[PDB]
From a paper:
Repeat proteins are composed of an asymmetric structural motif that is concatenated several times in tandem within a single protein chain. From these building blocks, we demonstrate that a wide range of unbounded fibres can be systematically designed by introducing hydrophilic surface patches that force staggering of the monomers; the geometry of such fibres can be precisely tuned by varying the number of repeat units in the monomer and the placement of the hydrophilic patches. All multiplexes follow the naming convention CsHRN_Rr where s is the cyclic symmetry, HR stands for helical repeat, R is the number of repeats in a single chain and N is an index to differentiate between multiplexes of the same symmetry.
We instead adopted a ‘Lincoln Logs’ approach that alternates non-polar patches that favour close subunit–subunit interactions with charged polar patches that disfavor burial. We generated such fiber designs from the C3 to C6 designs described above. We characterized the three-dimensional structure of two of the fibres by cryoEM. Notably, C3HR3 was verified to high resolution for the bounded four-repeat, bounded eight-repeat and unbounded fibre designs.
Numbering used by the authors:
A (entry chain C): 1 to 465
B (entry chain A), C (entry chain D): 1 to 159
Write the structure that this text describes.
């Protein structure tokens, strides 16, 4: 009698009705007949396990699952569907009465892509991989217990199909213990986070990217539980110390989303330089707070910190107790940006110069020895040259080419150091003349560019002015 | 109404949205409007050459190209953007239905350094050189014919 | 972790990588390990003088200087390289923070022949002559004041 009820519930669905009508027209009636035979057999295989019948009702009421089943019975792979329903029956039986775990199954099997992936994994004769994976699910769910935040994170992580594929791949390779260790690390991360919406939100965001999850699995595979635990502790501390300020939390979410920054953070948390990362996050907080809501400076900070090499340089410099050098450098950058105002062509040169990591290392070196006014006057001379370029774009293009080179910038800082500032000024306007004399004859501009761009001829030319 | 489609596809990109927000912040309200006027003009210059407007949907939906265009409209070189979009149109109509040649154009104009170099060469009133060079590209493509190894070398060497 | 940055920057150079691989082949692995130990020791002997770390990042990046250092570590002259790096550290520390003088040192030590002559002159236990000569360089640079003609002539003559 239950089979007739299930058949009726399936047939009364309008989408199912339209699909069945289409498949009746196209001559595939025996495919529908085989599918209903499989449904009857699945009901008879469930028997007195009424929770399995309640699962099948939900699974077949969904029209997309029914459409996938029709496509998969058509091509003669109905035995794959029988094997899948047998495995699902075994998984629901072995759980017994864990209603939260059966709720997780009712959720995961309703999602079409998960059902398609499971069908594909049951076709190629890898049934034990699905069995082991459902066992791991039940185990992690029982371990979670009275801690609904962790079960919510687990449900969200499993709903993502890419993470589901990664989990199936790692279970296939018999890395089950690595997966168990990872869920234990998630448990001892959620327990530590407690009720704090920002930290739980950061976990919910970060753990959802496949790259970060793959990196985490690749580190816990080599028995590195302490590394991951201390990294989550450092992130919790960074959120707690951040206070209420959206612009810092945004940078944390961004930088931690970037995979290579997360790799560098793991490498520096392993070697017991944890307090270095703490002080670095403090320095970022100070830079953001002292840089107000000025969007130009904030964008410059985001571009500078998003680049991994500059991030590593900053880590190495806070490592050896020179945090105040980084602070003074960010102060000089903020000062230079404030004098730029809305003159976007000049701010573009700050973006180009500071985006080059070698020039950032040189600037940190030049600020450390307390020559900061040299850098200040050099930025002012760059402004007093760009503002004099006016509307002549080949000059500014030559200047973009010239200042990107690290050794030319070093030589310019050297000539500003020894008190010959005016000569540097006289150089830049002189270049303007060679442009204005050049006009539109690109061969002369090309020759001038080949004479300017190399360091030795540059230092020679600086000596003749 | 394809202009509205272009606007939606352009502002949908998050980096483009960030750039536009920044350019609204620092007090350059009219520069975004001038750029969108140039975009509207470029759309209505294509007319029924739907492949050209598809090429514009490609080019303008790239953060680097769009930022370069904004900065290059800033300091009064607006017309340099109008001229360039004209010449590309001349390159597309004269190119005809050689879809592989339009593929090479899509590849080349996506690279920001190529687009900046072309902006420099159209700025100083050497547009004829860019037009002749696109003609050389078309001719080398037709001469190469259906022989994809040579077209791959051509793509790499011009990239 | 600065030492790791030096190792990565050194091994990024293809020529240095090939030299290391070749010396791995011939059964001289402990010579490469001893050289890296000397590098570590000189770095941690430099301390918080980041200018000295920059000098080591420059001098050791050069492939010929690395080759000469490796060959001098081969035949049992490790202490000679250690003494030379110590003397360079002392000349940078006593040199103060005159950036032009440190530029002269960065120039003169990048030249391979000057480095080989200094190694030969530290080998024979004449350590103080090198330090005295660096003192003479410091004095001549500080006496030149701001007059780049003379500093250019001096760089040329000492090169």
């Amino acid at each position: 009698m239950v089979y007739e009820r299930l058949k009726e519930l399936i047939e009364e669905n309008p989408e199912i009705q339209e699909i069945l009508e289409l498949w009746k027209f196209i001559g595939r009636e025996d495919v529908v007949e085989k599918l209903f035979e499989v449904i009857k057999w699945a009901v008879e295989e469930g028997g007195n396990n009424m929770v399995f019948i309640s699962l099948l009702k939900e699974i077949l009421s969904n029209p997309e699952i029914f459409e996938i089943l029709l496509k998969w019975v058509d091509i003669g792979r109905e035995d794959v569907v029988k094997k899948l329903f047998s495995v699902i029956k075994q998984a629901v039986e072995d759980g017994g009465n864990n209603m939260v775990f059966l709720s997780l199954l009712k959720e995961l099997l309703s999602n079409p892509e998960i059902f398609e992936i499971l069908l594909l994994w049951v076709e190629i004769n890898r049934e034990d991989v699905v069995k082991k994976f459902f066992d791991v699910i039940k185990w992690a769910v029982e371990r979670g217990g009275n801690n609904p935040k962790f079960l919510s994170l687990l449900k969200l992580i499993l709903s993502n199909p890419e993470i589901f594929k990664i989990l199936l791949l790692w279970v296939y390779e018999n890395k089950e213990e690595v997966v168990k260790k990872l869920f234990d690390v998630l448990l001892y991360a959620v327990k530590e986070g407690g009720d704090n919406e920002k930290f739980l939100e950061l976990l919910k965001e970060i753990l959802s990217n496949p790259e970060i999850f793959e990196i985490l699995l690749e580190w816990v595979e080599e028995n590195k539980e302490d590394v991951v635990k201390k990294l989550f502790d450092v992130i919790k501390y960074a959120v707690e110390r951040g206070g209420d300020n959206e612009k810092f939390y945004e940078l944390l979410k961004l930088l931690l989303s970037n995979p290579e920054i997360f790799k560098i953070l793991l490498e520096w948390v392993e070697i017991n330089k944890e307090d270095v990362v703490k002080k670095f996050f403090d320095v970022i907080k100070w830079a953001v707070e002292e840089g107000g809501d000025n969007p130009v400076f904030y964008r410059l900070l985001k571009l500078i910190l998003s680049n991994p090499e500059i991030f590593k340089i900053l880590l190495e410099w806070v490592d050896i107790n020179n945090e105040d050098v980084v602070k003074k450098l960010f102060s000089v950058i903020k000062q230079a940006v404030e004098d730029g105002g809305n003159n976007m062509v000049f701010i573009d040169l700050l973006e180009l110069i500071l985006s080059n990591p070698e020039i950032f290392e040189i600037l940190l070196l030049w600020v450390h020895i307390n020559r900061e006014d040299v850098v200040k006057k050099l930025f002012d001379v760059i402004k007093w040259a760009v503002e004099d370029g006016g509307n002549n774009m080949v000059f500014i293009h030559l200047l973009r080419k010239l200042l990107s080179n690290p050794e030319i910038f070093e030589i310019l800082l050297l000539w500003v150091d020894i008190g010959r500032e005016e000569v540097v000024k006289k150089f830049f306007e002189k270049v303007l003349e060679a442009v204005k004399e050049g006009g539109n004859d690109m061969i002369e501009i090309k020759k001038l560019e080949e004479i300017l761009l190399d360091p030795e001829k540059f230092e020679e030319l600086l000596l003749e002015v």
